[PDB]
Design a protein around this ligand. Structure first.
Ligand SMILES: *Cn1cc(-c2cc(C(=O)O)cc(-c3cn(C*)nn3)c2)nn1
Lengths: 13, 327
């Protein structure tokens, strides 16, 4: 639901 | 009917290859784990694709995700199959994985990361030596994919990715690419307006690899003369008028005559009569450092109405223009 086209959104190494 | 035509080189590569090679409709796609990839930032958008910068979390490596749209489906298999066939070829983008959203069923291609630098962005600063170097690198990709029985059909600066600090180039976006079968009458609604060959414009359907060599000549002209784009037509009809105003109408009508082409009646009143304008006429103070008699000879040998008369990718590689590229 904060997933875009099934992909989670990355934040930061 | 129109006179038949066969590619002068790599004619029967698909003919002597098994159907598993070129029969993309039968290709069973091996789907990977979508959970391995996470979106980093937006890279661009097209008319059927959404491109993103991403990270594979299993190894923390940068990748590029291209989410496909449902607008044009069953054409996803042709792209997938062509990328897998070309995998490992010189300067061909590496398809690293294929993933699918379990809920929306929307597929995504995961590519090797390359610096998000289009050719357009660099040409404005490239010197004569780097134009030759990168043009040769593009020719390696085109000779490879043609040798593998594939026409890219969308050669343009946007589809060339360059990492200048590593002088590394990749030919991308194989979404319009197709398998060459000698005798096939293809759809002429391919490539991008400014890069369409005369064959597309006159609806000559039995084209081949040489279509890519016209598109490449369009890019060379744009780079050496600093004119973006070189042929600026307002539509497919005017695009041929813009070509005619440079190459001339005489050679256009000789081309149509040679291939027994049925010229659309609209062309009778818009094509007119135009003499051939010498390549040297496009040379001025701002671009004379990028022009040479070799650049001009080479350009003249690519931008030819007759697709059969254009250099092949391997013949272009042997032209004196590339003598300065030290291997
Ligand atoms: C469900 N969901 C997640 C997000 C979202 C949006 C942003 C943004 O910048 O707009 C960023 C992130 C994010 C960044 N990092 C390091 N982890 N998550 C997530 N929108 N909706």
């Amino acid at each position: 639901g904060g997933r875009l086209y099934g992909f989670k959104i990355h934040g930061g190494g | 009917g129109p006179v038949p035509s066969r590619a002068r080189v790599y004619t029967d590569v698909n003919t002597h290859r098994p159907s598993e090679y070129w029969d993309y409709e039968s290709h069973v796609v091996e789907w990977g784990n979508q959970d391995d990839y996470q979106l980093v930032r937006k890279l661009g958008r097209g008319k059927y694709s959404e491109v993103f910068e991403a990270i594979n979390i299993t190894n923390n490596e940068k990748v590029v995700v291209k989410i496909l749209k449902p607008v044009k489906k069953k054409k996803i298999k042709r792209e997938i199959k062509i990328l897998e066939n070309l995998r490992g070829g010189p300067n061909i983008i590496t398809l690293a994985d294929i993933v699918k959203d379990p809920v929306s069923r929307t597929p995504a291609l995961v590519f090797e990361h390359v610096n998000n630098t289009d050719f357009k962005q660099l040409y404005q600063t490239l010197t004569d030596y780097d134009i030759r170097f990168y043009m040769y690198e593009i020719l390696k990709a085109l000779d490879y994919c043609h040798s593998m029985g594939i026409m890219h059909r969308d050669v343009k600066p946007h589809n060339v990715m360059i990492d200048h600090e590593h002088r590394k180039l990749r030919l991308i976006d194989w979404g319009l690419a197709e398998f060459y079968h000698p005798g096939q009458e293809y759809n002429v609604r391919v490539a991008s307006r400014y890069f369409k060959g005369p064959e597309l414009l006159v609806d000559y359907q039995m084209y081949d690899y040489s279509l890519d060599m016209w598109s490449l000549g369009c890019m060379l002209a744009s780079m050496i003369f600093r004119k973006e784009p070189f042929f600026h037509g307002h539509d497919n009809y005017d695009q041929l008028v813009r070509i005619a105003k440079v190459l001339g109408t005489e050679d256009l009508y000789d081309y149509i005559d040679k291939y027994n082409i049925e010229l659309d009646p609209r062309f009778n009143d818009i094509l007119g009569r135009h003499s051939r304008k010498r390549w040297e006429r496009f040379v001025h103070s701002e671009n004379q450092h990028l022009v040479s008699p070799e650049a001009l000879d080479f350009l003249d040998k690519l931008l030819r109405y007759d697709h059969q008369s254009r250099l092949t990718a391997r013949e272009a590689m042997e032209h004196p223009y590339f003598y300065t590229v030290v291997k």
